[PDB]
Structures are given as structure tokens and as C-alpha cells.
């Protein structure tokens, strides 16, 4: 249904946002450590 | 004009705020650039995915949009709560 | 296949060392590096064994390393 497609899209947005956050965190770690 | 606030989490928000909480310009819903996405305006007509306006089509915490920043796929918008 | 057509978003091979030669830490391990790339948290990203992966739109596939002094490094994955 349209409601279930929107929930699927929301979950995908959340997954991608966490991966963005984790990537930025990896780079911030490197800068702090260096 | 539509009220520029939300009574709950923005399910009925239909205003014209088009910047995210961090100040990024929203990507237009009818554009797939810089971010490809599945929130196709003609596929979800009751969600009012108009121009590049912040919307909450999917029971997000508040209205949001894809951003024109290639390094930021999407972000929540700063929609005040109605009083 | 053991090559990438772009930046390794779809890389699913078995290279398990970084560009500097360090052996990768297993994704399902929190030692020596604690991290948030939990395989069960990202089941569709193929975070298997200690293989180089690109789950997060990095420039190349990468891994956490088994060197306690080097948290993570890009891998050298051949281009198709």
C-alpha cells in the first residue's frame, strides 16, 4: 500500500542517515587522533 | 495562506518553509538531483509534496526535506508548534 | 566478483586487508575497535567476516583494522 511504501522509505532514510553519521564520525576520529 | 506551524508532528503541514533546521535549501520533490529518492509527488497526492517545501508524508518526527547539499541527503525542518 | 565498477558500493568480495597491508577487524567484533557498523543493524550492507566493504558512500571500501593504533583504513580493491 502507499502507507507501507512510505514507511519503507522512512526506514531507508533513517538507515542512510546513520551511515552518514558514522562516516563523519570516522573522519572526526582521525582528525582528533592525528 | 496555510498556517506555518504544526499542531502535532506536521502530518497536515502545508506551508512554504523550504529550508532545513541547519539552513540548507530543500531539494524539490519533483527533482532526483542531487538525491535520488522515491517520494514521487504524483505517487503520493494526499501528501502535498509541492515545490521544495518541508513536508511530513511518512510519520517522521516533524516535516523534513531532501537537501541540495550532496553530503546531506535529508534533514528535519524547524516548524514551530502551534499555540 | 573481485573488482569494483565505481567506488565499491556493491563490492562483496573477500579482500580482508587495508591499503597499508593491515588485516581487517571483523565487523561482528568490537575489539580492538568498538564501533557502530553492527552487521545485524545493517543486514543489507553485507558486513561479513572481516571483508572490506563500502556501506556508507566512502571513497572506497574500507574496514576497521586489527591494529589498536589504527582505527580504520581504506582498502585497495582492483578496478574492473
The chains in contact with chain C, meaning 3 or more Cβ pairs closer than 8 Å, are A
C55: nearest Cα among C70, C71, C37: C37
| Nearest-CB residue to A6 (from B58, B71, B73) | B58
Q: How many other β-carbons are positioned within 10 Å of the β-carbon of residue B29? A: 23
**Resolution, in Å, please?**
1.7
Residue closest to C51 by CA, chosen among C69, C41, C37: C37
Over the Cα atoms of chain C, what is R_g? 11
- Cα C45 to Cα B80, C8, C16, C26, distances in angstroms: 37, 12, 16, 14
Residue C43: CA atoms inside 13 Å, Cβ hemisphere, count? Answer: 1
Distance CA B20, CA B13 (A): 15
In angstroms, rounded to a whole number, what is the distance separating the alpha carbons of residues B58 and A29?
Answer: 34
Q: Residue B69's CB: how many other CB atoms inside 10 A?
A: 16
User: Cα(B73)–Cα(B67) distance, rounded to whole angstroms?
Assistant: 6
- Nearest Cα of chain A lies from the Cα of C39 at a distance, in angstroms, of 12
State the count of interchain CB pairs (< 8 A) between A and B: 26
Instruction: Report the C-alpha dihedral over residues B27, B30, B35, B37, rounded to 10 degrees.
Output: 130
Nine-digit cell string for B83: 499555540
Distance from CA of C45 to the nearest CA of A (A): 10
Q: With an 8 Å Cβ cutoff, are A22 and C71 in contact?
A: no
Work out the minimum CA distance from A3 to partner chain B, whole angstroms: 8
Helix, strand counts (H, E) of chain B: 0, 2
**How far apart, in whole angstroms, are the C-alpha atoms of residue A22 and residue C33?**
14
Domains (range + CATH), chain C: 1-80 (2.40.20.10)
What residues in A contact C58, CB-CB < 8 Å? 23
Q: Which residues of B touch A5 (CB under 8 A)?
A: 38
DSSP A1-34: -HHHHHHHHHHHHHHHHHHHHHHHHHHHHHHHH-
Distance (Å, rounded) from C-alpha B29 to C-alpha C13? 36
Looking at residue C77, what DSSP letter applies? P
> For residues B80 and B66, what is the distance between their CA atoms, to the nearest angstrom?
19
Q: Is the Cβ–Cβ distance between C37 and C27 less than 8 Å?
A: yes
- Calpha distance C29→C38 (Å, rounded): 9
Alpha carbon distance B50, B55 (integer Å)? 9
Q: How was this structure determined?
A: X-ray
B41 close to A (CB below 8 A) = no
Amino acid at each position: 500500500t502507499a502507507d507501507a511504501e512510505l514507511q519503507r522509505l522512512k526506514n531507508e532514510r533513517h538507515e542512510e542517515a546513520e551511515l552518514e553519521r558514522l562516516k563523519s564520525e570516522r573522519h572526526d576520529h582521525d582528525k582528533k587522533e592525528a | 495562506p496555510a498556517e506555518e506551524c504544526m499542531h502535532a508532528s506536521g502530518e497536515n503541514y502545508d506551508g512554504k518553509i523550504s529550508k532545513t533546521m541547519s539552513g540548507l535549501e530543500c531539494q524539490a520533490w519533483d527533482s532526483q538531483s542531487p538525491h535520488a529518492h522515491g517520494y514521487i509527488p504524483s505517487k503520493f497526492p494526499n501528501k502535498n509534496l509541492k515545490k521544495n517545501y518541508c513536508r511530513n508524508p511518512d510519520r517522521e518526527l516533524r516535516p523534513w526535506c531532501f537537501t541540495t547539499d550532496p553530503n546531506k541527503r535529508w534533514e528535519l525542518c524547524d516548524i514551530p508548534r502551534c499555540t
